[PDB]
Amino acid sequence: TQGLPRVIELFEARRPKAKAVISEIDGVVRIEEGEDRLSVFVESEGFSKEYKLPKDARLLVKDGDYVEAGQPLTRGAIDPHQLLEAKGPEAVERYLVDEIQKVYRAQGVKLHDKHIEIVVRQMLKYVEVTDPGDSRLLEGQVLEKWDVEALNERLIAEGKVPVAWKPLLMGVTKSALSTKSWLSAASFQNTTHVLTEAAIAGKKDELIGLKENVILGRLIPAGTGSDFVRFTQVVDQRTLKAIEEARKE
Amino acid sequence: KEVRKVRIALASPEKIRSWSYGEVEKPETINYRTLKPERDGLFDERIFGPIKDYECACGKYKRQRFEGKVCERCGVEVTRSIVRRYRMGHIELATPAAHIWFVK
Amino acid sequence: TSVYIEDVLHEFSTIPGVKEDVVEIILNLKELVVRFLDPKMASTTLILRAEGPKEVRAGDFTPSADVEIMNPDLHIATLEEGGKLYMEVRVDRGVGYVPAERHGIKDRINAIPVDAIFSPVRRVAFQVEDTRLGQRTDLDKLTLRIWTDGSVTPLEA
């Protein structure tokens, strides 16, 4: 597939048509049989993992070749969820960006990677718990807010459980969906679920993002509405010394 | 002080009534031939705000520094028309009623 | 500058026994060119009365003390059996092209102001040619042509 459909496929972390098999394990390649049935083995010392192909499939490892942890066997597109678990979160990030660009580039478009990066990182915002310290053992949690517990219960109040987690490739939509602040969350496909829930828990916003404050009619937390700049006062020569002569009174 | 966080909760029947200003648990509203809101009903000036800016519904002191005035017979508070944007009402149910939200 | 027609109220009208309508009659009038004569003459008012099976044609206007219709002939309104007309057509002294929407006219009502195409000059061209006048093999012979609606002369223009 090409064009915009690809860019969505990508930005949405979507397990495509012609997943074109990757080897789960390292090892040595062995193509076997033609026309009748086509299968490929990547068997190292110990394990012998077998990858049955369509037969029509245009595989791109010839017999004998040595192979890599998550290396493509077959051609086609690659599942970004299969890549996550086989070969980590960075390798994922690096696939997404470089593939998304593979199209804008291929066409005519020139844009900087950082944009795509900024977005891609958000696809990696959350992680699911395995064996917790405080909360229930299954919940999805923001990568940072788990460090708010991991490197918290292993320093000052050290002990209990560091909270083990798993890397969690969220598609662009899904990730947008699971977004802390209820105000923002409300604007998506089912506003009731949000509010119902957020009402039960004394949930609070804090209104960090923008989608939030525009909803309220508040002054956007960016540009001139950035905490880092909007408090800036300007005092004016004679105003300053005259303001100084009523301070020691 | 200035807002910095917003927190949603649930509504204690003691609050829903604390908000309320009056009870619209009484008939149904808007005169059509005149334009007066019907007494103790979904627009009753007596319970929300004066439909007109300051002023009562018959004749009182259209002042500014007197703060909170209620009339002779009718019960309208002489204090800006924006009020009707914000004053809450309530219907006191006779029995139960579940928020369908927390139900379905 | 504007017109009165007898039983006409706006431009988008028609007159019976007149193949023309007010619009098309006006597009005609525009072309009419009146030479003035008295220079005191700032603005006259021409009057044309027409009747019966007649081709009304500028020159069918009423002659006036200080007015010379420069392009008689020129169609105004083909009239069929039973056609009247009576026009009060006002000629003003102006310059350049003044759209009817700009000036307006209060020669009574049902007046329909008319777009003003004043310039007597009809077209101009000029010729920079080689001369025979005993100096350089690089001099100039100018000749401006000038065309006008005979109301003012090339020479005067």
Added chain:
Amino acid sequence: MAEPGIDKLFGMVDSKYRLTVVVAKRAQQLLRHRFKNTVLEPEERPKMRTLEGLYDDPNAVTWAMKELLTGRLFFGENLVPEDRLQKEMERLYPT
């Protein structure tokens, strides 16, 4: 004919938005006192062409930027408290 002296203006500040905020905050005071507040006065004040001669440009922000551009004003990020800021403000012919 981009903003007059803006390259200089962007360099005056850390985050550009700060620039806006100052221009604004100044064009603010410079308005809420009839311009009896200028630092630039003499023959520095910005002006206007007309069917008439040079009149005092009536654009606060335009003035604000010319003003700032002369180093004659200061950006307190937190210098002089907001409670005392509206104090000695309404003083030198405000009403």
Added chain:
Amino acid sequence: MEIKRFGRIREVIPLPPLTEIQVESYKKALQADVPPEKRENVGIQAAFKETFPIEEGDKGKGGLVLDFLEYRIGDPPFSQDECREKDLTYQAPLYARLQLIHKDTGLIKEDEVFLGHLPLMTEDGSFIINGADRVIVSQIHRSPGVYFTPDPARPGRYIASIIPLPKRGPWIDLEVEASGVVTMKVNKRKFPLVLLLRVLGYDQETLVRELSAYGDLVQGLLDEAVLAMRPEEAMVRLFTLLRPGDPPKKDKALAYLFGLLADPKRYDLGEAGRYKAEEKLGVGLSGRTLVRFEDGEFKDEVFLPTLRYLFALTAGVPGHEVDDIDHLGNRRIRTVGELMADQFRVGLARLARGVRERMVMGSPDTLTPAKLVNSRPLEAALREFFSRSQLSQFKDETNPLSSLRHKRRISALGPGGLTRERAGFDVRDVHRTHYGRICPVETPEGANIGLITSLAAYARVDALGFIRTPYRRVKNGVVTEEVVYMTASEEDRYTIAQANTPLEGDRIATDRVVARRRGEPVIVAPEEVEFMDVSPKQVFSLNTNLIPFLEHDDANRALMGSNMQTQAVPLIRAQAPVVMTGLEERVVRDSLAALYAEEDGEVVKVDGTRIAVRYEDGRLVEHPLRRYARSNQGTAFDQRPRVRVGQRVKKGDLLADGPASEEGFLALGQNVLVAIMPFDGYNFEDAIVISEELLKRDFYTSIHIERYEIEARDTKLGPERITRDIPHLSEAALRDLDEEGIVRIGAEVKPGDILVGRTSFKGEQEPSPEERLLRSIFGEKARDVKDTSLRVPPGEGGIVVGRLRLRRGDPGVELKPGVREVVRVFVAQKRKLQVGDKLANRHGNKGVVAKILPVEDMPHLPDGTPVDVILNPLGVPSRMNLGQILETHLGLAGYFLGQRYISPVFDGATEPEIKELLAEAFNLYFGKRQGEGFGVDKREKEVLARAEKLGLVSPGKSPEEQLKELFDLGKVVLYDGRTGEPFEGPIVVGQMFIMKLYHMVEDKMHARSTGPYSLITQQPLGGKAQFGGQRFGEMEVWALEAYGAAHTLQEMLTIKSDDIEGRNAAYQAIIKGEDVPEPSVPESFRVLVKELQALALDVQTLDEKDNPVDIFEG
């Protein structure tokens, strides 16, 4: 001007009646001029027959029948115009001579009955419906037959589709699952096919005999031993399966529906269903998917033999192929006639149930037709169509062509049998076949691209909805005069030669004859050719046919100029283009916007009102001119007389012109002196530069007519009344109102001017005394009535040209409940080209006038003549509409040579001819300059010089001889108006026909500061005095977030919309020269919080110290 005609191929057939689709369709559905004995099916005639041996409850015990004998079309109670005035639908009552019989006998033919009202089509092709001319567009769907198709959800497999005529049977699909099971899908219910096959009596062993050994496919269709049963029991189980509830053995009942009889599956009486089900399938057929009453048991006729081909395509010997669903031998055309008739079906269908309903409620002794028939199910079903079906557009009336072209439209959408606006891509593409029938060019640019199309000039929809193109049979060498229109399928079996092909006398002349077959372009021996194109005009639409050098225009820009012509508004000095294609006279003819003679006679009377002619002996008729009437799109249709007093008339020749017509030929615009060069950035991107000259000459100027309407209704508060007695109003405001409240004609109306006065009552309070005491003491009589008059809306205004009044009561007039009297005021407006308007040419070179220049500027020829419009070259190369360039060249000839041109499509001028004419022209143009006393001034010599350095003139030729060189290449030495100095290097200059389009800056362009805030949404919306208020979309919300524009965004979100508190504080500050804001709290916020409280839920707002704030103080 004398006209020069171009090119060979002598048009064997003239274009067919054009609106043929519409006009001849109806006729054959309404045999109103044919005795009710003949009337051979189809149309209304059949739609009765399809319904009308109507029984009553029970099968042969209770009496009463009621049988159709013949229908009678009534007569129009209101003239074509009364209708459009009184707001009615041009109709005629329809009567049925029905006949109800009994069990004791009694043939009662009640003297017809009124079953409803039938809308009559005009001469035009168009309808009139509740005023307003509507057009029913012809739709296309799958031509009934049997199809198969591939299966989108399971690869390497197939489905089978049994599709009957629309509203004449159900959609039966056959598909085999991963189970093996074959499954019938009908009426969105799915059971195992076998069950049906069991009913039609197939036996476990007959099936294997018939359907085995290709594939292990039967094996699945088998195993249901459980119901490989008693064909009667099969029937019961299948009836329980199709209609859950009633479980008896009269399952023959329903099973007779998707079986025999002309109730449902009537895939044809004996036509394109049976026929094509035979060739594809295993031949030999009658007319229904199976036959029932063979003697009292069903006998299969299509189901199995389909299944055969279904299996025989899941492995299958060659010859058992898939089917091209997009072939026009698979696509049918529902014309008006049929849709209108299909709607009778719905009507009569309903009318029957409600007879059988009244056969049960009534005593059989007295029941009569008239007492059984209701007259409202036929009406409501057929009122609904002409009024509320998607296929019934208004009527694109901008210009003659636009209208004409409307009627010849074709669309795959529409009702039921029609794809949605979210399906079909294989459909959209111009499939091979469309050739000569549908246009490869006319479709709208986005959304419904390909879902709508133009019927082709020579195309004809036929007998059963197949479009047929004319061809020339060539008897092995000689091109015969015989012309054979033939199907999209009846074409894939011949070898047809192109028209571009030469000839000697009456026969093919060259040795390597070009032609196609099936689809492939093929080179062929002369003797090996069978048929011949009648013209290239075959291939394209009416509008696509009007582009004089189409051959040279890239097909994209062609489609732009094919439409766009349809946007071209008519002009006061409208003029037929300098370079024509032929149909321009005929387009105007078949549109009937122009008035033409009836029978060669002699004109007697002629004025702006009437043309009256004495036709040779045959009495005397007066033809009234429609004059400054207002087209649907506000355009101003108006006829002008083109004929003099006491003149003999040509058979049927122009008595009068239409709106976009010049002496009978099409006049969508002006031809005008053009120069293709850059100006000074004024023709940047697509912008055009104009010469004021054009305004002085009132060229591109056009008369638009608005239409205003007001109603007076009755009210719980009293009647809305149309007085001129409007309270408080100064007798100067009332000045233009007649004693009724309605503006005078010829009244000049500016915005905010009463157009129709109207007082409404309204009870907005009661005045408490003191005020009542004050009222008398100071005179002005307290009034019971508010102002609420009509008034001209901001932006509008012009001359009042006609009023219209309709009163509840008044004869034919029927306004909606409440509405009592309606007033209509019509307002004309001369327009005139304007910066912001858009001119286009035939080759799709659209663009906006961006600067008018006074003639002092403007490039000018040496003779002095200025050009008119300055068109930018940079426009040409990227779009590849080279025809415009050629058109300028031929045009330049014309100017000098004094002629217009007819250049056919793919048959018009060639350069050889064009340059010959440019030659002839320069010879007169320069012959003048010499004969007047001149020649080649320094300015041209300085150009002509560098002109050869540019290899554009032959060196070693005279400046005069070099001038011609250029004039022939079509360029000239232009002279800069601003500065007499010549443009360095020659410019192509010439006459180009250019149109003024539907859009104008007048109607656009709006600007608000403040005012009318809605009481519902509280954001500015609508404007009685001041107007408008622009939307800030979510896309713009982004931009402001993208820029750092905090306050600016917040401005757009508060003080210029809902925030009452804020806007008020802001506007009270701007009035007083204050800074504006410090907006207390975004209203948005308050609103939401409260809108939350209302739903329970506290929503605490809290500062950084985490305590509460109260964003309200009250």
Added chain:
Amino acid sequence: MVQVDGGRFATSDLNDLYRRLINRNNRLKKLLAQGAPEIIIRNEKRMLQEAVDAVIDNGRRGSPVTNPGSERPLRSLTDILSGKQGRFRQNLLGKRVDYSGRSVI
């Protein structure tokens, strides 16, 4: 409650439901005061929940609260909030503006 021309009105539509409810509460609130039949109060109580169901989220359960006349379902306190001009989304999506204007460029 806004008056369309004459004595025709534009009632909020939520206002409607907010009565449907006060009529039940006052019916199933009278019954109980004098004359309390078992089965009768039951259905009235089944109605008063259902009436609050409507004000909150009309569309649910299955039967939508129609209006004497049309079958259009009429908006609930949920819809006020449930996007598209619905309080949460009105801002980031719409809003007509007070110093604007357009024209051909």
Added chain:
Amino acid sequence: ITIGIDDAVIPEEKQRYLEEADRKLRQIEQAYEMGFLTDRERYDQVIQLWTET
């Protein structure tokens, strides 16, 4: 600058270039009549001629 039609100048090569292309096309059909080129082969060959020409 302007675009006149003679500004869409065709190269003196095109005629011959197509005569040449024509000739080679005759040599392709003949080569299939024998049997050198399969149905497909000969198509490909015809297509790859025009692409080049």
Added chain:
Amino acid sequence: IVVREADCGTTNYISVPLFQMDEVTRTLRLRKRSDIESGLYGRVLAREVEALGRRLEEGRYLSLEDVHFLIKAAEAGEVREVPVRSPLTCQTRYGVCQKCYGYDL
């Protein structure tokens, strides 16, 4: 995601490559000029880069010259990746920092 504080301080980075491996041919080529800039222009160096007798200091913002040089410097076989600061590894959570992202204002 908003630039919220100049530099989070973290010391991971990204290694923008200047060569590409064609899975079809297994071969490596130095990537299209255009794309290189799109990975580098306006980036901040994560760790120093020395090549062609030039040291690029830690946390230097790379101009278009710099990139252009870096590509020259890769063809002379001295540079294969560029250790660059990126939003992918910035550590301010609720937005990238100033020193990540870097530039493209």
